[PDB]
Amino acid sequence: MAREFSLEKTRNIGIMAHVDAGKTTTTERILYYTGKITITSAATTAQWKGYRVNIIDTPGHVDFTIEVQRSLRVLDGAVTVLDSQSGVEPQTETVWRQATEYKVPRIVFCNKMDKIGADFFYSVESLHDRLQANAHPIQIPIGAEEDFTGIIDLIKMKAEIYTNDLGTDIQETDIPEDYLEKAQEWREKLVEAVAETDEDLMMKYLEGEEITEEELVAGIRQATINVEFFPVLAGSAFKNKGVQLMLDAVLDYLPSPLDIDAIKGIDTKTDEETTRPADDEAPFASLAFKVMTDPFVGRLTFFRVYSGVLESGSYVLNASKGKKERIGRILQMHANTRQEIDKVYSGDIAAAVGLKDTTTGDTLCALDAPVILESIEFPD
Ligand code: NA
Numbered sequence: 001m002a003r004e005f006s007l008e009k010t011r012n013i014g015i016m017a018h019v020d021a022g023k024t025t026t027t028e029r030i031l032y033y034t035g036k037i038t039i040t041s042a043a044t045t046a047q048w049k050g051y052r053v054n055i056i057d058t059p060g061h062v063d064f065t066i067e068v069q070r071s072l073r074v075l076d077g078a079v080t081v082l083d084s085q086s087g088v089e090p091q092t093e094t095v096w097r098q099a100t101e102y103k104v105p106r107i108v109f110c111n112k113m114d115k116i117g118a119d120f121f122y123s124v125e126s127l128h129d130r131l132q133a134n135a136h137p138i139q140i141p142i143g144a145e146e147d148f149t150g151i152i153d154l155i156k157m158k159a160e161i162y163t164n165d166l167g168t169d170i171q172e173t174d175i176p177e178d179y180l181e182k183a184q185e186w187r188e189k190l191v192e193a194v195a196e197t198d199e200d201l202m203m204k205y206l207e208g209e210e211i212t213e214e215e216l217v218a219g220i221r222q223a224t225i226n227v228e229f230f231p232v233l234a235g236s237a238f239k240n241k242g243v244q245l246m247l248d249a250v251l252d253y254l255p256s257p258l259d260i261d262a263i264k265g266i267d268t269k270t271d272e273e274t275t276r277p278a279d280d281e282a283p284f285a286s287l288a289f290k291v292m293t294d295p296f297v298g299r300l301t302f303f304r305v306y307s308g309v310l311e312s313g314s315y316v317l318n319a320s321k322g323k324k325e326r327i328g329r330i331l332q333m334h335a336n337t338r339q340e341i342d343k344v345y346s347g348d349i350a351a352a353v354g355l356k357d358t359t360t361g362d363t364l365c366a367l368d369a370p371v372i373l374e375s376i377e378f379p380d
Contacts, residue, residue, distance in 0.1 A: 003345050005052035007258050007278050010347045011250055012304070014058040014071065016099065017081035018091050022111045023060045026081050026237040030055060033167075033243055035335030042290035042302045043074075043349050045332040045339070048247045054349045057290075062094050070361055070375055072102040073263070074289045074304045074349070077225075077254035079246065084110045084234070085117035087126035096131055103261070105224050107231045107249050113141050113148040114236045120144070124232050135230040136193045138220065138249070139242075140186050142179060151234055151242050152179060154187040155213055160245065167240030191216060197223035217252060224253045257347030263287075263306045264378070265363070265371040268319065273378075274371060276307035278346040283369030284308030284316065288362045292351070296338075297329065301355040303364060306373070310344045310364075319372045320362035327364075329353040 015030065017023035027040075034046035034053050044055045056075045059068065078099065082088065088096075099106065110123045120141050127135035142150035142159060150161040152175050159179075161171040175183050194216060195205035201219055205211060211219075223229030231253055235242025262277035265285065276285040290302040310316065312330040317323070331351050332339045344350045358364065361375040 003280065005047075005050075007345075007347050008256050009050060010052045010054070010256050011048075011254055012054045012056065012074070012076040012257065012347070012349065013250060013254060014056045014075035014078040014104075015081060016058060016078045016095055016106070017060065017111075018083075018089065018095070019060045020086065020089070021081045021083045021092070022237055023081065026079075026109065026111060027055070029237045029240065029243050030079075030247065031335045033247060037334070037337065041333050042292060043333070043351075045334050045349065048251060051251050052348070053247075053250065056349070062091050066376055067360075068098060069102065069377070070287075070289060072099065072104055073287065073375060075104070076257055076260050077105040077107075077250070079109050079250065079254075080106045080230075081109045081111050081237075082123050083115075084112050084120055084123050085115050087119075087123040088130045093130055096133065100227060103227050105227050105253075105255050105259075107224065107233060107246070107253055108135060109237075109242075109246050110232060110234045111237055113144065113234050113241070114146065114239055116145050118144050118148065120234050127230065127232070133230055134193070134223075134228055135232050136190050137186055137233075138190065138231040139233050139245070140179070140183055141234040142176065148236065148241070151245060152183050153245070154183065154190055155217060157183060157187065160242075162239075162241045165239040165241075167243060170244075194219040194223065194229070197226075197229055221253050225255045225259045257306075263373055265373040266378075268370045268372060276371060276373065279307055280309050280346050282307040282346070283366040283371075284310055285363065285365040285369075285371050285373060286310065287373055287375055288355075288358050288364060289360055291355075291359055297331070297353045299354050300331070300351040301358050302349065302351045304349050305344050305346055307346050308366060309346065310350075312340075312342045315367060316364050317367045317370055318358050318362050319365050319370050321357050323357065324367065325355055325358060325364065327352050327355070 262275040267274040
């Protein structure tokens with residue numbers, strides 16, 4: 001009947017992580033924290049503090065084919081996970097450059113801060129040296145290796161101290177005195193780096209004016225969405241340290257569907273290029289990204305809606321196959337449940353029951369406003 005979560009309050013994300021960086025644990029913990037109400041699902045519908053969060057599956061190994069490019073068009077932003085002991089590795093770099101080519105904003109989670117050899121600053125520096133990435137810490141860890149016990153928020157200049165490995169009984173305190181100057185130092189570097197991404201901010205910073213928290217957070221957000229800045233966080237997913245903070249950063253800095261360039265397509269009627277921006281009033285257009293065989297409802301086809309709205313029990317056009325398709329039931333797969341819905345809006349992800357001739361990469365769109373979307377980048 002009504003759109004539950006607005007476009008502004010939607011986050012379509014992927015987790016970019018090599019198997020050594022702890023992809024599965026991080027994903028499992030994210031699904032746990034965002035699922036409050038082995039088969040890995042193509043996309044999980046979830047929530048975090050009033051925002052819709054859709055976690056989209058991505059490969060744990062380097063993909064040099066076309067399949068990688070497709071998932072990058074479905075997700076809007078990503079969390080890149082690093083093994084704090086190793087920093088950026090060759091495989092990590094390739095994945096990072098692909099994501100930059102396809103303009104995917106990212107926050108970086110330096111995982112395994114409790115492992116022997118874990119070095120947050122080394123990991124941060126490797127982003128600059130090996131990728132020329134404009135990465136800046138928005139946190140500094142309290143301790144390292146078995147002494148890793150907390151995380152300092154550079155924005156608020158407060159600290160979280162963990163008392164267990166469950167993610168409960170978190171003590172919110174002031175920064176310990178032995179880390180205050182170091183925190184001040186890294187916060188100054190952060191302010192300076194953010195100021196360098198915005199002319200109006202740099203003018204104020206150079207003139208010595210006070211940059212507010214709201215202005216600093218907004219600056220980080222805009223630069224991150226522009227793929228010209230990468231906030232760096234720390235934690236241990238397996239020991240439930242820094243997970244909630246990282247999820248907060250997804251909301252704070254990663255893009256909503258309105259923050260991304262509108263998807264391009266070919267209008268088959270005029271034979272010219274067009275776009276399908278996130279607009280519930282515009283004609284329906286979507287991309288299928290995974291075909292699943294579910295052991296309950298049967299053939300499920302996952303899709304991402306870019307424009308318009310789709311009602312369950314309707315007819316749409318598979319513009320890639322050149323034929324009309326019936327959309328029966330529509331489901332959204334949660335971590336612990338499966339919800340049936342009668343309408344999917346722009347920017348959301350869902351799964352249609354029993355679609356006959358639809359495969360990954362196909363455009364599903366309005367019968368009256370046909371378009372072929374750019375799943376694979378158009379030739380030139
Ligand atoms: Na994208």
